[PDB]
Design a protein around this nucleic acid. Sequence first.
DNA 1: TTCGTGACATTGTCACGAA
DNA 2: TTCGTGACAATGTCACGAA
DNA 3: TTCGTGACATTGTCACGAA
DNA 4: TTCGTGACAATGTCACGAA
Lengths: 149, 148, 149, 148
Amino acid sequence: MKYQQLENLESGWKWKYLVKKHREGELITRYIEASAAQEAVDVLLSLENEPVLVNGWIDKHMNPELVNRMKQTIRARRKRHFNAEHQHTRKKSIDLEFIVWQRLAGLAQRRGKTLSETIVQLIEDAENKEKYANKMSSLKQDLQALLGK
Amino acid sequence: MKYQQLENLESGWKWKYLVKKHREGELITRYIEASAAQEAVDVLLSLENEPVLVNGWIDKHMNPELVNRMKQTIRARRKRHFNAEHQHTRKKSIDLEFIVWQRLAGLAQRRGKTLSETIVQLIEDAENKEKYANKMSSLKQDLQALLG
Amino acid sequence: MKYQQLENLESGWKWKYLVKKHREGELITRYIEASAAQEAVDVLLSLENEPVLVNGWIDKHMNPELVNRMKQTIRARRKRHFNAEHQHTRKKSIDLEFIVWQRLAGLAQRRGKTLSETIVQLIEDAENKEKYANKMSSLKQDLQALLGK
Amino acid sequence: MKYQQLENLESGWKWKYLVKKHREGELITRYIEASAAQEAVDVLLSLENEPVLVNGWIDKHMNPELVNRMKQTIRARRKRHFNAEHQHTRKKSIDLEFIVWQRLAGLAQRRGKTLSETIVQLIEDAENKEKYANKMSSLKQDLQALLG
DNA sequence: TTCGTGACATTGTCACGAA
DNA sequence: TTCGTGACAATGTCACGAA
DNA sequence: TTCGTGACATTGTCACGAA
DNA sequence: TTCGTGACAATGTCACGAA
């Protein structure tokens, strides 16, 4: 755990979680009835401006099989923040032709390495071609003259 | 255009659109007062089963701040469909590191070509360097052998 | 022929011929009996200083059987003389061991060319040893500084 | 001394010599006189076959101008004899041109080798060159097998 | 001094190719 | 046949170097 | 089990070169 | 205008190997 915790906002974060889903429709509560669950819908809706008070509610009305989906989504956004505190870590997304990907990826999984470097190497292996064209050609074209003189 | 329209469903999306955005907080409505605008929410949040009418709702009810944002976001949800059919047309998202991007994009910036052209051109040439190190490796292997 | 003839002088050495050979122990006359044969001898030595005389003498008197041996021994001196003049013209001999003679003499009957010339080449190519003794030592170094890069 | 000096023939040998130079025109007597010469001539010429005779014939009766001339010419014939046997020790002479002799004799007299040997050592080198140009044809050729 | 030895000069045939 | 020509043969010397 | 993290999926945007 | 389109932003999971 290289990224510290922030009880304050890190809690309000989870709050947004039980919202972004409840909106599109997804059993937030750990109950089955649409009577006991519906009730809980408001039991939290009011905790808007309510910090750590949010945690009090997890042990109360929080669907178990969600604890997984959440942790995974939390840590994620958790890293993005700290990583956004500068540039080198700030990641960016890219869209390219399918077939292209297939190669790349297939080259990442086959070239015992991760995408990143795999892209870093595929580059160095390119700019080197220029001086490798002649480097191999010179040692070959300069000797062609030995056949006679 | 390269793709044709589907009035029946096409408009369908927009619906799915105005709702969505609304669900998150937005005045899809062309009005303001918590009344008239309020009605136009339910008045539209119903054409679900008969979306072939949403269009006539957008032409004289939807907030104009979204006319463009839509024609775009839709025209996209359109291409995104037809390509999602086959495989060669499909697409894929990647998440590479900052540093890389610079150099990477940078190259694509100096050549101008597609950001994908970069992976082709880099694989195509950077792979031809993996070639001369082979013709220069099998050569230094049969050159010195005969010699000593 | 090629050279010239010395009517007077050449009869000179020509004379010494039957002479130096007669005292050696051989028949110069064509008379089996020691009466006419011995007569010719005495009559011969008297010509100690006569040219043309020796000519007619050889005719009626000398043994026309060794003639050939003479025409050969005489022709030689014709040549050994005009040649012995200038240096590059004078011929000279040497004693070589059999072993060595073999190869050499045997390279003449194969290559065809004269014995002398034979040595002329044997030498040139030989002396040229360094010329190609270096081409290798040299040409071969050009490949070493390459294979190791 | 390596050659067993067999007084038997070697003596008779001298004879032919004293006889030869005689038939040519040279004194074979220590006599300061003409006539006195007719003595040795026939006196010795009759020794057609005299061992110990012709021998002492010298210490007591023979020209002095030939004392060394003989001791040496004799050694020659002597060596020629034991040598006449096997061809691997006997010899032959050559008639070569002057100019050739020069270069030849030169290197020979120079390198500090015997005339005969000179040729031998010179032949080896005369072949190496003819051999070195060969390895050139193999290497020069094995370069285009692959290269051009 | 004697001797083994290498370098030539001499001088003589011998079998040949082009007058 | 006639010759210039080349390959060796044979035999004597000479100046050296080790005995 | 809790993390960090990398591989990707959806879906919204907007300048752009023709059409 | 209207399309097709490409570079990224936001962010929600999932199955990994070290803690």
